[PDB]
Design a protein around this ligand. Structure first.
Ligand SMILES: Cc1ccc2oc(C#Cc3cccc(C(=O)NCCOCCOCCNC(=O)c4cccc(C#Cc5oc6ccc(C)cc6c5CC(=O)O)c4)c3)c(CC(=O)O)c2c1
Lengths: 144, 145
């Protein structure tokens, strides 16, 4: 339920690395091609617009980065180890496939792929998209 | 004022800060972008419209109308561009950056630090809702239809 849990993981394509944050409760994601500085900055930018409370990671890299440790402290985020995404860096890989032609730089193509994911109906028809649903989840938690 | 944004450039430490403002909420998003308005300005908006609903984008100078790349980005993402930007958040954003500038090496971070603060403060102490609170309520509301 919690409106501010996320997962974080990397994924590689065309030699460059793609950091991916997924809001678990909704499936809304954000991504970017990238250091621990980069991730720290990435997280700072993310915490600065969504409720980013706890970040789950599946390896130890992030718990060694000084800046990251400084970012979470500054923004008030709990790193957690432990844990949807492998089912979801493959869709992103799929969508990036259909757009890579449209983009000079890989980095535009990811954001295109991001665009698609958050805008399309999660159900393929009717209901909400992920971008709508994250907003809905958050709206319902403040009025608490 | 559902998906209406306003766009502007601000300057400090010999760098260019692009600033997107959601009109009805005061919600802001910014980034360090080149003097040249073009590819990276188009990239900024693509990411922006991936995060939020973005239908219209106002400006009151011609820079955003000079770039082939920006025109395609708005075309690709379904945005509308309109001249005339009918705000001064740049006044207080620079104040906060000045406040938090010591706590980071890169101006970049300080900016995102200031962005963070501007969008999260109010309902604070009393207040009612911050920009970030306001944008979410506006959007969640509109989706009702
Ligand atoms: C407490 C705490 C917490 C967290 C923290 O974190 C950090 C950090 C950091 C850091 C790390 C390393 C470098 C730098 C840096 O100094 N950084 C300079 C500048 O950085 C800003 C700019 O960054 C580069 C972005 N550049 C682009 O995006 C780009 C470039 C070129 C082209 C394009 C494009 C496009 C595009 O768009 C389109 C849209 C639509 C369509 C149809 C087409 C297109 C196209 C074209 C295409 O089709 O391809 C984009 C900063 C700190 C800092 C500290 O520890 O004290 C910190 C501290």
């Amino acid at each position: 339920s919690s409106p501010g849990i996320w997962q974080l993981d990397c994924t590689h394509l065309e030699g460059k690395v793609i950091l991916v944050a997924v809001h678990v409760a909704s499936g809304y994601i954000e991504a970017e091609v990238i250091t621990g500085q980069e991730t720290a900055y990435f997280l700072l930018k993310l915490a600065g617009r969504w409720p980013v409370k706890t970040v789950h990671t599946d390896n130890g890299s992030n718990f060694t980065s000084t800046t990251v440790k400084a970012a979470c402290e500054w923004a008030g985020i709990k790193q957690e180890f432990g844990i949807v995404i492998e089912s979801m860096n493959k869709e992103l890989k799929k969508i990036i496939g259909q757009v890579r032609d449209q983009a000079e730089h890989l980095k535009t193509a990811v954001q295109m792929a991001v665009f698609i994911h958050n805008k399309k109906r999660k159900g393929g028809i009717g209901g909400y998209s992920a971008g709508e649903r994250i907003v809905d989840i958050i709206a319902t938690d403040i009025e608490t």
